[PDB]
mmCIF file of C-alpha atoms in Angstrom:
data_model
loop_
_atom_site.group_PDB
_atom_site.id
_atom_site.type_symbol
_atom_site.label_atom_id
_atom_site.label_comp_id
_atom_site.label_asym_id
_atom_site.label_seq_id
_atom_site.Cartn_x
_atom_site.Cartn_y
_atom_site.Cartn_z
ATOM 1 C CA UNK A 1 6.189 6.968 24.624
ATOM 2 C CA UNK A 2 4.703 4.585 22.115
ATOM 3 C CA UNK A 3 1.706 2.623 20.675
ATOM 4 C CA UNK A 4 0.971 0.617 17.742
ATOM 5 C CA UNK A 5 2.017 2.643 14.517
ATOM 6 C CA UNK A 6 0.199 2.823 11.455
ATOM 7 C CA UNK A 7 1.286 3.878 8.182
ATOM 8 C CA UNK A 8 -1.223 3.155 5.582
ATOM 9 C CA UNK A 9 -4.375 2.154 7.872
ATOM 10 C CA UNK A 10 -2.222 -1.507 8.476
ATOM 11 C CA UNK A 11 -0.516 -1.902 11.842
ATOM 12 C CA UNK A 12 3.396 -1.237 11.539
ATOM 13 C CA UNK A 13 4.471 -2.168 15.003
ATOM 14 C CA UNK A 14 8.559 -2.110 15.004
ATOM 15 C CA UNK A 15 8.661 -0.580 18.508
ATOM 16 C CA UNK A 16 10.406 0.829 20.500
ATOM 17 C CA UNK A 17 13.832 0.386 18.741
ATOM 18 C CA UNK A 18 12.469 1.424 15.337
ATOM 19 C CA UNK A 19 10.592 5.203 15.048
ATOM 20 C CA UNK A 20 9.489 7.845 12.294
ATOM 21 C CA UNK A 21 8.372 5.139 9.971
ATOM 22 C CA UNK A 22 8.087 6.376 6.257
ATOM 23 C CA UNK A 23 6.132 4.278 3.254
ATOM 24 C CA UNK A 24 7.955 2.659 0.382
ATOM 25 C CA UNK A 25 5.960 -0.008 -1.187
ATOM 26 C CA UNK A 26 4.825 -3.496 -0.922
ATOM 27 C CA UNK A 27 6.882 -6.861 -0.638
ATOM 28 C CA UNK A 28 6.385 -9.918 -2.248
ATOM 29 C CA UNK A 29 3.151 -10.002 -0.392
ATOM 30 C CA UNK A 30 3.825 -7.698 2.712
ATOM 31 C CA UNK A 31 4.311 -3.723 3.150
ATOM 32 C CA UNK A 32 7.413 -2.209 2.664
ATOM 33 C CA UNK A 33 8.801 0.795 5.279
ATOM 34 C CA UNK A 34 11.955 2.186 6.289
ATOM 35 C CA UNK A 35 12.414 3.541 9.603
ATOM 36 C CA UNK A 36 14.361 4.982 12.096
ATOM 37 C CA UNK A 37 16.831 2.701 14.248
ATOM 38 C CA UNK A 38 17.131 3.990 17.771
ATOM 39 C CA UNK A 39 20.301 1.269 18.708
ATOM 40 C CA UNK A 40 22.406 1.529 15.516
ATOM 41 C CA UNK A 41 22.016 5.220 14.458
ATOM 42 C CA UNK A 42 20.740 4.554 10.884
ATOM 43 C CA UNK A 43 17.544 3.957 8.962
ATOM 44 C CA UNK A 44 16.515 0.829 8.009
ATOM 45 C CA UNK A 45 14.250 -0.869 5.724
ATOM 46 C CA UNK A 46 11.664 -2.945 7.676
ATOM 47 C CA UNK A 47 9.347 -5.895 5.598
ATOM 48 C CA UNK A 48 5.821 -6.529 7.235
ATOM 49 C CA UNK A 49 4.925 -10.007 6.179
ATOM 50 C CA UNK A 50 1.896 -12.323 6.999
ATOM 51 C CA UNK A 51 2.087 -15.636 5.724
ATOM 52 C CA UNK A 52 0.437 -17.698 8.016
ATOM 53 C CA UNK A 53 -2.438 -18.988 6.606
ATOM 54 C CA UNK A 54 -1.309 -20.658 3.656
ATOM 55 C CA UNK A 55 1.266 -23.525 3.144
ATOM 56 C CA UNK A 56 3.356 -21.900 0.092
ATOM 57 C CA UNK A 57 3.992 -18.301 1.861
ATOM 58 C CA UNK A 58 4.845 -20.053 4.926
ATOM 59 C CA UNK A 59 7.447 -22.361 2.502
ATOM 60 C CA UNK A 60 9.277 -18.995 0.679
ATOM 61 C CA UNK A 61 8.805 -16.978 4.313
ATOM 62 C CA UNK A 62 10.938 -20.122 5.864
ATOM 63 C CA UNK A 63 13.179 -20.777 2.994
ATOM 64 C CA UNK A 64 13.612 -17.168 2.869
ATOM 65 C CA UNK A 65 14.595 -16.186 6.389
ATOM 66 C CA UNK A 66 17.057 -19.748 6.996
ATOM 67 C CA UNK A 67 19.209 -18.642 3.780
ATOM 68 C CA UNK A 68 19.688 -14.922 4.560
ATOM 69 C CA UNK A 69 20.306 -15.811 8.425
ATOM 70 C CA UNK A 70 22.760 -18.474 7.065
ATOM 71 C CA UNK A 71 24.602 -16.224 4.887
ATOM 72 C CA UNK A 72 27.188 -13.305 5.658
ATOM 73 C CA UNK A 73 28.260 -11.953 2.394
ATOM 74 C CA UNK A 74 28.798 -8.465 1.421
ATOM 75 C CA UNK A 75 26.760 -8.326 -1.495
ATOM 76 C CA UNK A 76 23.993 -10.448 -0.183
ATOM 77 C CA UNK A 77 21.163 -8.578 1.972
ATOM 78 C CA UNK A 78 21.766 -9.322 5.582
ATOM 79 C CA UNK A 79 19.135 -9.627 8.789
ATOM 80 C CA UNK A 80 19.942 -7.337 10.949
ATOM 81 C CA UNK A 81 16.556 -8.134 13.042
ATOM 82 C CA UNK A 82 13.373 -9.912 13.512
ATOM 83 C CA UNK A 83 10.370 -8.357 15.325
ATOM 84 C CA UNK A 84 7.732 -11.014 16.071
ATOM 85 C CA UNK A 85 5.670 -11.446 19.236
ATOM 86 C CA UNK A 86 6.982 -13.918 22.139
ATOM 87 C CA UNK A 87 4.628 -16.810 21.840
ATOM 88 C CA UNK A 88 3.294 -18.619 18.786
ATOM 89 C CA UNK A 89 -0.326 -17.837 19.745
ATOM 90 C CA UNK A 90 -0.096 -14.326 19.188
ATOM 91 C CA UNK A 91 2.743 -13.971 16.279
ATOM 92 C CA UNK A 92 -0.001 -13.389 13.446
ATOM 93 C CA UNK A 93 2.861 -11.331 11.527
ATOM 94 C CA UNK A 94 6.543 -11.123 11.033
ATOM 95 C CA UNK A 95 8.676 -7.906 10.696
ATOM 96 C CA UNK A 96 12.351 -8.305 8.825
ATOM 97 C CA UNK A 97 14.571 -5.469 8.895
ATOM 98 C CA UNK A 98 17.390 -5.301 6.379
ATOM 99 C CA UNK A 99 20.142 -2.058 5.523
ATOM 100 C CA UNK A 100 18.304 0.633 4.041
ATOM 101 C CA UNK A 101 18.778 0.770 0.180
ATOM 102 C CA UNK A 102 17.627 3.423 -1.223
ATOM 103 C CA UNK A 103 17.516 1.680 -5.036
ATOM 104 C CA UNK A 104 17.926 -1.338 -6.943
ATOM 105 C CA UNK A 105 18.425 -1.791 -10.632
ATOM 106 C CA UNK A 106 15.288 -2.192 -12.144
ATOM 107 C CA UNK A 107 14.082 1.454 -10.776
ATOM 108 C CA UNK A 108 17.937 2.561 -12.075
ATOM 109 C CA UNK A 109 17.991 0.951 -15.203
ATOM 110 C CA UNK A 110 14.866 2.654 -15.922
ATOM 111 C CA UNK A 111 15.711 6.052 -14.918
ATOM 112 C CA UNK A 112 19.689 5.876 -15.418
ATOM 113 C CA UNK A 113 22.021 5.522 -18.508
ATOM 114 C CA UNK A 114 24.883 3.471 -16.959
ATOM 115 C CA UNK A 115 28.864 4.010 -17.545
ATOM 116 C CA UNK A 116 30.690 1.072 -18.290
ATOM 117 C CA UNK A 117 32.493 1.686 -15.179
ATOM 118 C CA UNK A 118 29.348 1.216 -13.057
ATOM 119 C CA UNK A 119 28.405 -1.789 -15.476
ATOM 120 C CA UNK A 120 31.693 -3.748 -14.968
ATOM 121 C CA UNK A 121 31.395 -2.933 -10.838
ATOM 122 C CA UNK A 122 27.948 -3.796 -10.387
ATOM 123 C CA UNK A 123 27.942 -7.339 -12.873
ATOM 124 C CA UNK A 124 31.399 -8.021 -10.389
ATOM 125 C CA UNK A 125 29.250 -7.720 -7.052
ATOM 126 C CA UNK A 126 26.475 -9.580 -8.662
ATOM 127 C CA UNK A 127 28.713 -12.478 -9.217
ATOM 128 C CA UNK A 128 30.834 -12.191 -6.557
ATOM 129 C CA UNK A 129 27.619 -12.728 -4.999
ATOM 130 C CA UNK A 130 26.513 -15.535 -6.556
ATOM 131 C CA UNK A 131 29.502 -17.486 -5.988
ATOM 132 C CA UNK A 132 28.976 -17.326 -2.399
ATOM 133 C CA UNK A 133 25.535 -18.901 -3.016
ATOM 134 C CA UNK A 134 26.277 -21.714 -5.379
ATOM 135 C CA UNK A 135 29.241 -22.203 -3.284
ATOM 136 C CA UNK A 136 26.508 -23.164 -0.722
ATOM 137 C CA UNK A 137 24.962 -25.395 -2.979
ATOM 138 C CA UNK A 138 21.668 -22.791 -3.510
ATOM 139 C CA UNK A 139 20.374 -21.599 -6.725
ATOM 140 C CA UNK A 140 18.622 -18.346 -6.544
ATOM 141 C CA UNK A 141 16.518 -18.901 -8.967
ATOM 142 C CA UNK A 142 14.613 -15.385 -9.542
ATOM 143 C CA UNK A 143 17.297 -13.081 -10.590
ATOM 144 C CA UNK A 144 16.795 -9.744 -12.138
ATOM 145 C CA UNK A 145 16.898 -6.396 -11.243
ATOM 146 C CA UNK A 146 14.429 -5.322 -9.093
ATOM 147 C CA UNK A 147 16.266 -7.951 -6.793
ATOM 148 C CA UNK A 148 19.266 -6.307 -6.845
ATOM 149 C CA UNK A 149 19.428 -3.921 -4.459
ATOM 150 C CA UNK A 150 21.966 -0.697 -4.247
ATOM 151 C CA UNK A 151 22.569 1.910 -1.712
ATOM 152 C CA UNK A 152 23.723 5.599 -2.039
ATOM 153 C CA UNK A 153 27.671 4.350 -2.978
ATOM 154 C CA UNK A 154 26.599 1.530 -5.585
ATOM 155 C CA UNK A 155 27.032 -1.154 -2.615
ATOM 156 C CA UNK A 156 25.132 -4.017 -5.096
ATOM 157 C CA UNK A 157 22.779 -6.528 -2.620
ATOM 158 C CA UNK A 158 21.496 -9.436 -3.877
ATOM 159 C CA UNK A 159 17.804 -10.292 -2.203
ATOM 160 C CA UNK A 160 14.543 -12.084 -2.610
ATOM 161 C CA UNK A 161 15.788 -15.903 -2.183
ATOM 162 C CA UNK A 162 11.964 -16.901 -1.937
ATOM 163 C CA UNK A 163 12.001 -19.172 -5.053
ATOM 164 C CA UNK A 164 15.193 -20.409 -3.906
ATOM 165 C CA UNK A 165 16.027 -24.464 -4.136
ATOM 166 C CA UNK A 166 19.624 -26.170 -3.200
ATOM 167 C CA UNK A 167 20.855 -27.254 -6.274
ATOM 168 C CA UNK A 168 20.183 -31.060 -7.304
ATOM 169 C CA UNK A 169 21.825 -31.698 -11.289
ATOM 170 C CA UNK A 170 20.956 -35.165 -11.057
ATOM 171 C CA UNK A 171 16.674 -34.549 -10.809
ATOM 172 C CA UNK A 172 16.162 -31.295 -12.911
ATOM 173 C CA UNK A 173 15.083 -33.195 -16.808
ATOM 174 C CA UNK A 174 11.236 -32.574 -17.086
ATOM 175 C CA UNK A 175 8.904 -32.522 -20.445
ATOM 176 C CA UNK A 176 8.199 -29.887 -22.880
ATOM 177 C CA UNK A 177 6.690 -26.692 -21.118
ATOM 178 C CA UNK A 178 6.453 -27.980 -17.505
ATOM 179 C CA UNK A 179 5.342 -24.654 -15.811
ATOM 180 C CA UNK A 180 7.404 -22.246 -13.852
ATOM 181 C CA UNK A 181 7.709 -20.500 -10.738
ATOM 182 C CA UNK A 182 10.695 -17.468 -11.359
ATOM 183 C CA UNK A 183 10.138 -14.011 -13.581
ATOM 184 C CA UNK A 184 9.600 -14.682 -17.172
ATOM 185 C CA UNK A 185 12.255 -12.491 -18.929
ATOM 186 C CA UNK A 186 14.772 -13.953 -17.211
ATOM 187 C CA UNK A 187 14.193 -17.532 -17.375
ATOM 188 C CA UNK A 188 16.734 -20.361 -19.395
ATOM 189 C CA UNK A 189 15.591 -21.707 -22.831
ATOM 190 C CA UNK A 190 15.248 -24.740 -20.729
ATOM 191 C CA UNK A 191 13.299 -24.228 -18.224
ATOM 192 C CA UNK A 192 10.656 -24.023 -21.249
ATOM 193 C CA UNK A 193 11.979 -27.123 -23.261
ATOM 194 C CA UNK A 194 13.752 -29.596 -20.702
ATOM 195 C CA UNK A 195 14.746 -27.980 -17.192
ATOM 196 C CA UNK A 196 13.231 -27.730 -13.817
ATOM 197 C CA UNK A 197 15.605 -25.042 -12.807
ATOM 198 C CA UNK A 198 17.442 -27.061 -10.599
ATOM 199 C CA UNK A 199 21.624 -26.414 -11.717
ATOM 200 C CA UNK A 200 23.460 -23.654 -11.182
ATOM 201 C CA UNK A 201 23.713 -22.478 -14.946
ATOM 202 C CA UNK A 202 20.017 -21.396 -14.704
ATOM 203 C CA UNK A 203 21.439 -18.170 -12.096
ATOM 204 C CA UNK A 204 24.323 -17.414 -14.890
ATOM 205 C CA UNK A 205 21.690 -17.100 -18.061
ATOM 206 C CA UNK A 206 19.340 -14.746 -15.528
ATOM 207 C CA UNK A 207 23.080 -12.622 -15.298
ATOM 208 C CA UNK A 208 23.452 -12.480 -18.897
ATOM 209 C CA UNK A 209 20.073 -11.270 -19.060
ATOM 210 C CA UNK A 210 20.483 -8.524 -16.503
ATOM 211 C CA UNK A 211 24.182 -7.483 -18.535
ATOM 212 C CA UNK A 212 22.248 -7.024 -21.758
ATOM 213 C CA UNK A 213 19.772 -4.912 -20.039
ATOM 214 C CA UNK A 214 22.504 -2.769 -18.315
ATOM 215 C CA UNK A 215 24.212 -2.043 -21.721
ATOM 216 C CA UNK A 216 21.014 -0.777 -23.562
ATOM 217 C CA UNK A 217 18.361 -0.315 -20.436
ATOM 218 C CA UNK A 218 15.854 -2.428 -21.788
ATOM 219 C CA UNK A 219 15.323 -6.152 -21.442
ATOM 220 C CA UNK A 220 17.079 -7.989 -24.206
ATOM 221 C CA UNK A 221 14.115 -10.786 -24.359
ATOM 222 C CA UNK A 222 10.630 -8.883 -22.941
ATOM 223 C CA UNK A 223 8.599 -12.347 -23.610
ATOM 224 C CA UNK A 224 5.028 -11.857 -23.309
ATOM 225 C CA UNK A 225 3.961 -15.455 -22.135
ATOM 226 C CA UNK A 226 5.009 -18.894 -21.727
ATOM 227 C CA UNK A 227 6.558 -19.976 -24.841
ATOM 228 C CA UNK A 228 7.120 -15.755 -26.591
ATOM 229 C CA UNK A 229 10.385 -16.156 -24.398
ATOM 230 C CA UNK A 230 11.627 -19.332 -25.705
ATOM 231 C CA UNK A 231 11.147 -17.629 -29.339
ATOM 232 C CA UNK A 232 12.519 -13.864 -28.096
ATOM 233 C CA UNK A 233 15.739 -15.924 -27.133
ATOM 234 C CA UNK A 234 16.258 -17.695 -30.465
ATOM 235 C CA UNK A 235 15.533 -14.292 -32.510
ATOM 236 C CA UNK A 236 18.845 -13.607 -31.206
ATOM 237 C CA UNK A 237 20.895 -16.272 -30.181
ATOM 238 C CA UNK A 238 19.619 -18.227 -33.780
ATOM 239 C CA UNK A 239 18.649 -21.562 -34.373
ATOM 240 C CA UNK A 240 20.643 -23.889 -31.998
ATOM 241 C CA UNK A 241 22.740 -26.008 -33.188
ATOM 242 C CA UNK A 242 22.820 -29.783 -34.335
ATOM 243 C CA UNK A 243 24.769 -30.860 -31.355
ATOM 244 C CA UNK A 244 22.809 -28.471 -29.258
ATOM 245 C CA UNK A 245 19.239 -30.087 -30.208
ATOM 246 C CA UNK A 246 21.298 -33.668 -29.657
ATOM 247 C CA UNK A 247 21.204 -32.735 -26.078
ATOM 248 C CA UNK A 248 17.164 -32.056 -25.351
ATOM 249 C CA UNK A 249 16.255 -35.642 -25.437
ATOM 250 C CA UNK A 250 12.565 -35.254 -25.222
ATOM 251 C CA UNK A 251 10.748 -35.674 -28.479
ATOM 252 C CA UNK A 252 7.749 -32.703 -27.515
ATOM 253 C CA UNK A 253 10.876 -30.115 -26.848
ATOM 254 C CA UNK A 254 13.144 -31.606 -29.450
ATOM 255 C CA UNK A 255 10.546 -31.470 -32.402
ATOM 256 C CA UNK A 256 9.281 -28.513 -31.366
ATOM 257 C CA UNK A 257 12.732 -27.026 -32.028
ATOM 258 C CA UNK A 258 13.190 -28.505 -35.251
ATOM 259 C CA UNK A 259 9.473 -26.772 -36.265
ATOM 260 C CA UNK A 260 10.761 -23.329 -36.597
ATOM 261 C CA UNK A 261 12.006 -21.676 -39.114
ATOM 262 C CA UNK A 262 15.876 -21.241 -39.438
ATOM 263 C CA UNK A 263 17.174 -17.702 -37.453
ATOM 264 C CA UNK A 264 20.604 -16.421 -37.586
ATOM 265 C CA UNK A 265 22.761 -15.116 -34.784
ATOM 266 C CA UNK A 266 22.319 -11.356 -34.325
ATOM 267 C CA UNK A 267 25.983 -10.160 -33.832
ATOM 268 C CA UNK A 268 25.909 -8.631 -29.887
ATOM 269 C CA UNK A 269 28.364 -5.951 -31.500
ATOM 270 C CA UNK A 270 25.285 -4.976 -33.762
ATOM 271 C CA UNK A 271 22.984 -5.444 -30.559
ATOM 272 C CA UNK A 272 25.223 -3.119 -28.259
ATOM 273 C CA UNK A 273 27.330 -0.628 -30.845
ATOM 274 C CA UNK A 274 28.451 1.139 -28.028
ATOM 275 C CA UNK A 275 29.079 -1.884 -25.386
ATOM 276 C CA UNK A 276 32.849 -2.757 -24.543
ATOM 277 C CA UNK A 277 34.014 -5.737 -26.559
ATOM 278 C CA UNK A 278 35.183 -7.498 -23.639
ATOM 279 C CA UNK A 279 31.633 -7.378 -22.292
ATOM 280 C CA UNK A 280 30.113 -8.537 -24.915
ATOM 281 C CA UNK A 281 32.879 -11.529 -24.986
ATOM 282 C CA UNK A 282 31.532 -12.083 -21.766
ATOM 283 C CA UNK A 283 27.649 -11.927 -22.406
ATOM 284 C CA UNK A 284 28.202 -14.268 -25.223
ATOM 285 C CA UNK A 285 29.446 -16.991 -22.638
ATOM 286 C CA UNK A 286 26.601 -16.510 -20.282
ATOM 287 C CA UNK A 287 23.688 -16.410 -22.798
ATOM 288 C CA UNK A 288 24.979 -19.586 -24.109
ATOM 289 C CA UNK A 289 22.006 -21.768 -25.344
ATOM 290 C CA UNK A 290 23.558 -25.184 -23.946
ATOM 291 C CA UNK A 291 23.119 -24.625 -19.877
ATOM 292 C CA UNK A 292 26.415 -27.490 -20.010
ATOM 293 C CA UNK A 293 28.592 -24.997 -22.394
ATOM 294 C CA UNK A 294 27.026 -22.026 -20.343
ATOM 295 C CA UNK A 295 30.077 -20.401 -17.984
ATOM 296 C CA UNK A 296 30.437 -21.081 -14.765
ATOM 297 C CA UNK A 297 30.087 -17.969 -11.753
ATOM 298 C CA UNK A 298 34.379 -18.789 -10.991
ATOM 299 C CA UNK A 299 34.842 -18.612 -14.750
ATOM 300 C CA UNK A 300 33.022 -15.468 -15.406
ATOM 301 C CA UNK A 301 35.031 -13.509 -12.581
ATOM 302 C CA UNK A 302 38.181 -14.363 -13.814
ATOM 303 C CA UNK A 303 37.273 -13.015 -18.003
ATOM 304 C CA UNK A 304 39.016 -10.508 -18.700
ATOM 305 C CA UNK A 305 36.427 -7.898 -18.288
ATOM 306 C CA UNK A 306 36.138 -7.959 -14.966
ATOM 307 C CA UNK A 307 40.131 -7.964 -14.443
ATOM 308 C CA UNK A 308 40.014 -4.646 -12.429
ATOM 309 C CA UNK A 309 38.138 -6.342 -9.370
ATOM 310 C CA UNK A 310 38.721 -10.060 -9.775
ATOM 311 C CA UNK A 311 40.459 -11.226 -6.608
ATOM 312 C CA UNK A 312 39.713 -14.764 -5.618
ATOM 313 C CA UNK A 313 41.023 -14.369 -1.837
ATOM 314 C CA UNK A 314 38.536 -11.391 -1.628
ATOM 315 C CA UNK A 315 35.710 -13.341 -3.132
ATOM 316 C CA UNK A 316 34.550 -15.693 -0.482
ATOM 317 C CA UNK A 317 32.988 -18.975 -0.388
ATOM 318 C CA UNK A 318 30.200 -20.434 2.055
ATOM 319 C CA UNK A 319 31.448 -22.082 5.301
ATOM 320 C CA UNK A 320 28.451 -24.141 5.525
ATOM 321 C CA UNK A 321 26.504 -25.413 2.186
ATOM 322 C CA UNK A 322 23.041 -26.799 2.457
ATOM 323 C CA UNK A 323 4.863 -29.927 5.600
ATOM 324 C CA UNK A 324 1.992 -28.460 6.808
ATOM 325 C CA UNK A 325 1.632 -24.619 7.345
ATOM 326 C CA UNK A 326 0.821 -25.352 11.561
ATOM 327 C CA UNK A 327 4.837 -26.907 11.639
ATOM 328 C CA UNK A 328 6.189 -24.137 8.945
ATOM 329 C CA UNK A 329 4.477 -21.615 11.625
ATOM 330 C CA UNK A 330 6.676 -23.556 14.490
ATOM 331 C CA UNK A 331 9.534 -23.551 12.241
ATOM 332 C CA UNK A 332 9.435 -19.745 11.538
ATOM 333 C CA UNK A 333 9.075 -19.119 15.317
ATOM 334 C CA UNK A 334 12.445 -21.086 15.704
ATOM 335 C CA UNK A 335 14.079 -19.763 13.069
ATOM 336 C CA UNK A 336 13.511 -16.253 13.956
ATOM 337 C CA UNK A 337 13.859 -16.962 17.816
ATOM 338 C CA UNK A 338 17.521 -15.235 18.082
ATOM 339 C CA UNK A 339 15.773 -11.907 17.518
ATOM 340 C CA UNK A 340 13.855 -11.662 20.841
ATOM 341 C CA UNK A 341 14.989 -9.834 24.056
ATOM 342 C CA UNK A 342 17.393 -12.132 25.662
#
């Protein structure tokens, strides 16, 4: 009737409920499966993780797991189950199963030419998203598009909330290339000049980034290290401004600023030729170089580009905002507790 399952030589062992396992790919560290759900008559994706020997996976495994269980938003990846084994002594791995998505829009983008109909719809869920998490005082912190996930009707799921932090304005000022966690081509001039990622305007310049790349399918800013980013970003946004520089207080990012030779805007209408001019309107105000002058998730649903969804009763808002590996281990087992035959 059963046994433990193997996929790819590695124990896969979802049973009973979950049957006729097929491969995907890996996790963040962790294979990837989807799988048949016995209860709810549906596949599934299932996530094998193993985290427990090491502090930081333990941290993004916990983080990870107490934001999705805390959230219930459409166009956020739910839960739907946690397969562990009864007693911290023998839990060695953790199984998450989530709604089977069968893409997401980096493997789209790279595959698909996009109408502007499925561009306007898909950067609508994406923010309608991400208000509900800065409305709960989290920053994601590592958007882009493989972490947008989409099933076989253009349902848009926003996942991967392992570099997630709740926001904190007040501590985010650090020096001049202070090193980062999140996915280079989407990071905020900042976070290589003054930022530790830590307000909400770092999410909106990661959406601006992932609009550009749905208008022309390739990423507008494809740094190749560190600092290549900060200078892919000013090749098109120009030299900032007097005012702008008055802002970075630090001498290191400030003078390195003033170093470089003068660039001009490139015109997004040049960019894009054949992106909608209310778009771009809208692009413009999210890859703003000044994170305080940068638009706000509210503000960007209600521009005019997105006037076919927006809906601010049908765009909800959180109910309730918000160590040593051997207590994170305790702390998973309690978190994920719910999930177990009772």
């Amino acid at each position: 009737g059963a046994g433990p399952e193997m996929v790819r030589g590695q124990v896969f062992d979802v049973g009973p409920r979950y049957t006729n396992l097929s491969y995907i790919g890996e996790g963040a560290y962790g294979m990837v499966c989807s799988a048949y759900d016995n209860v709810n008559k549906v596949r599934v994706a299932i996530k094998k993780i193993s985290p427990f020997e090491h502090q930081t996976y333990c941290q993004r495994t916990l983080r990870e797991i107490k934001i999705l269980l805390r959230f219930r938003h459409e166009n956020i990846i739910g839960i739907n189950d946690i397969i562990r084994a009864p007693t911290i002594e023998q839990m060695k791995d953790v199984y998450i199963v989530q709604d089977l998505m069968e893409t997401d829009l980096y493997k789209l983008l790279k595959t698909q030419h996009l109408s502007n109909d499925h561009i306007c719809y898909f950067l609508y869920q994406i923010l309608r998203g991400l208000k509900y998490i800065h409305s709960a005082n989290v920053l994601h912190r590592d958007l882009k598009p493989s972490n947008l996930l989409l099933n076989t009707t253009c349902d848009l799921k926003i996942c991967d909330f392992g570099l997630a932090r709740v926001a904190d304005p007040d501590h985010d000022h650090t020096g001049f290339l202070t090193e980062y966690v999140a996915t280079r081509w989407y990071r905020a001039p900042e976070i290589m000049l003054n930022s530790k990622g830590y307000t909400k305007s770092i999410d909106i310049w990661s959406v601006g980034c992932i609009l550009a790349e749905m208008l022309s399918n390739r990423p507008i800013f494809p740094g190749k290290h560190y600092l290549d980013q900060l200078n892919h970003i000013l090749g098109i946004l120009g030299s900032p401004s007097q005012e702008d520089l008055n802002c970075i207080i630090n001498l290191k990012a400030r003078n390195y600023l003033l170093s470089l030779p003068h660039k001009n805007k490139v015109p997004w209408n040049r960019l894009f030729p054949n992106a909608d001019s209310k778009a771009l309107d809208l692009l413009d105000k999210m890859l703003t170089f000044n994170p305080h002058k940068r638009i706000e998730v509210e503000q960007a649903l209600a521009h005019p580009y997105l006037e076919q969804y927006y809906d601010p009763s049908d765009e909800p808002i959180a109910e309730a905002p918000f160590l040593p590996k051997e207590k994170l281990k305790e702390l998973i087992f309690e978190e994920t507790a719910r999930f177990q035959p009772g």
